[model samples]
Target: PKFNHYDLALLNPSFDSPLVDALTELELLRHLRLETDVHPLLFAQLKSIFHMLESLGSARIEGNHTTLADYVESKVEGAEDSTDQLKEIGNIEHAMNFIDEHLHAGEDITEYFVRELHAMTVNGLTPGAYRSHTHLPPEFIHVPAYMQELVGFMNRADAPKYDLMKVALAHHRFGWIHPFGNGNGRTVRLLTYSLLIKYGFNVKTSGRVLNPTAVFCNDRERYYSMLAEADTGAVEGLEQWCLYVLTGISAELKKVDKLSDLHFLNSKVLYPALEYSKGRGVINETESKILKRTISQGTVKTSDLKEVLPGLKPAQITYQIGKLVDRGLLQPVEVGSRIYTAGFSKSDLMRGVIHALRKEGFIPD
Candidate 1:
């Protein structure tokens, strides 16, 4: 079998008209100084929701048929044992969390980091190690060198302006390595995610978008075709691939930033989410009013609810907030704070959140 050849220098784009335009927008996005109205608690919930979509998008790109609806319903109902497909996507979800918690630009991503990603990607479905290429990957001996070069290129001290192009180029080259047999596609997507975190797309701080998989998943055919074009080893093909990648990323960065405004988030996602849950009887009218007040107020004290819930005694209001927290529809503003805010990502109300996200065009239909 033959190993594919890739050149790192091609990452330096000419910054022609449209490519330059997209790169300019992405750079501005990377440096955006944003103070979002989303409470850190709710932002954490949204981050987890994006991670779920990222996992599903990567799996779907690999031919898994799990839809956003299918996965959201499973989470809403609390599946005791997941399907193999769900397990695979769940593995990716956890791996993304691992990256979010552990990987950052403060450190370099090494072979050890890449190996750990492979292990997590195939945690339940397949054995973890570099593939020996009885299939399409190169011979086992070449993988280590290829991977070293790949990571080296990624970790190189390139000028700040070239960061996004490097991410786009590294994505194509990682697939060229195909280090893992069973989960190369999934693993490389995680690789792309790691590099983005390294570069500055830390969703926690950026509060922009975390679903980088959307760049590929939104149009799988275009994604693969661009990858194939880059694999053709032509400079023009590589430029085209980077253009496509950056263009999609720019679109997502702009689109998802809308949620940072509490008004937009509530009108388009949160309030609609509560309505969805209420319609399904997942939350009662009383519970719905309680959550609505909490979301509207950002966080709420039991005393703050007296006007909204006039029939209830102060003790009864405390009891109801306690029940909502127990049921995962709300959480304390801090570990011991009496203040509370709406909780959906970790609750049965996630069914509603997912529905609202789909309606808002954040999640694909």
Candidate 2:
């Protein structure tokens, strides 16, 4: 009894099914807490890393096998970009960045907005258009009309009043809709992320989180089969779909938990760099702050630091910067014509940072 695109209730489950209830409980108890305590810069760094790495997974599901190192090969390959692979990764990054930069609490997911997401994702292939023709094998939920109803469902759905559930359901059903002619896969992910953060699940209270592709990206056959199950109109299958989402969310959280040692991520990499002079009877908090910012963002100029450290006067900042250079907390870097300082105060500490990150499965082992 395959559910066609007609039954809206199939997309929106009844409020009392035990499985849906259980899945909702699972989401709250495990994945819904906020990562409020993470430092702003640190959170930003981790989030960017997730998007970059996840983009590889997302594209892999689309049959793109471009590795992370190769996709950013201009930095490593030392030459001009020459492949569609690089372009695809670049486009995905741009779209993800757009969502991260602009999506907010109570943000609108209007028809116009969904179209805009598609445009950003496609990057020029059939820019800004819905599927206009019919095709075989899971033919769209029927575009123009399908999008209207989806927008309605997004705008007016009620009971249980759960935004995250709306998020999860919409992601599955959006795949069903397949609105964009060539980029539904990409836009589905873009919207998955937009809805996640827009509805307030952006930060993990602890551990790493993933985009929707985390579900399908790992096991493509199962992902489509599950979507295939939801399409079966059995009504009960939607619960199965929700459970799948909960499963993916839980798995990613555990992966991140495994990778994370709270002490290593914060106190070791961050706290040490930011408080390098703490035990030396040094009283300048702002100098360490500048060092942390420098290494975290790749490089920092002394002139920039002189203006950046908190409350330090001109001569005072200058003296502090020189003192840090002398302390070996800051190491000089030259990029063609410019000079900067970038390093952890400890000689092996930066290598240790790379080593630890690799152990955590963050550096692709």
Candidate 3:
């Protein structure tokens, strides 16, 4: 029989073994102050790239066919005619930006916040509101109370010790309720992101890059399998669900934090992207070397590029930097400042960067 009850007791589970280990490690990471040496501009670019990956992965979980390579290429080309699939993913990106802008740690995950997520998630695709029903399963009436309880549980659930547990169970229960007529999966993932921030994974303040969606997107089959396992509403099933999610969270946190190390990021991800871009003729050899210097140094002034472009005069080097700036391959460290950093988030370089990430196995296959 399908599980249909809404009892909060379903959230109760015996915490033991790896579950305890998962909780302990996640707590350790939660307070681990990240000393990110990556330049703020480059960090922002990395965050945007991860956001794209997260958005695309969320869409792909719902069977959106837009591949990461195709999406990144489209972005590089600045394609104006967006497919419905692209728009779906774009809406998710926008909603993520909204969450980053408005929601923060120590804030409540209120009804309006959830409604806004739904509306933005289904923007220009569906009604972007609550599911409608004629006394069917998960009928309209149940949605209101279930959703309210879901948010209430999210905001004031239990002690700090149970925050990770709540994070896991709330995700399952949202899927269990099936609140929206469409876009439930996408919204719920974003909701998980918000809760993670509220419960102390605040990436903005923590100097870490997080892709919480990766926990599910890494293995879609297992994600669904585990969701069904929790659907049974048994204590063991829910406990297993929590273990799966919290464990995945712990792993993803560790994996993404490694990106903050400049050597790993450059050797494995960024510098390789420059090579790929050059091989693809998206950037010439000189431009590639110049960009690499900017990346290696984090930020470079015109004087810093003389070694890279020894043949060129100071004015010519400055002009070359200007050209890269015009092409969106680099940006000023500050407003109208001469110092520049490598940029890929909005440039033709994103194609190569995304490809490099895939090659490095940072992106989900």
User: Pairing residues by index, what is the TM-score of model 3?
Assistant: 0.89
Estimate, for each residue in 222-261, the C-alpha lDDT of model 3 and write its tens digit: 9888888877777777778888998899898877788878
lDDT of 1 by residue, 2-41 (tens): 4455566745555566788888988888888777777766
Q: Cα deviation of 65 in candidate 3 (Å)?
A: 1.1
Error of 2 at 91 (Å): 0.4
For each candidate, what is the lDDT?
0.81, 0.60, 0.81
Question: Candidate 3 regions off by >4 Å?
Answer: 1-3, 9-16, 126-128, 134-137, 203-207, 303-315, 333-339
lDDT of 2 at 142: 55
What are the root-mean-square deviations of the candidates from the true structure over C-alphas?
2.6, 7.8, 2.9
As a whole number from 0 to 100, the lDDT of residue 64 in candidate 1 is 87
Give the per-residue lDDT digits (tens) of candidate 2, residues 147-176: 788777766646434665676678777777
Q: What is the number of residue pairs that collide in model 1?
A: 0
Give the lowest summed-lDDT range of ten residues in model 1. Answer: 131-140
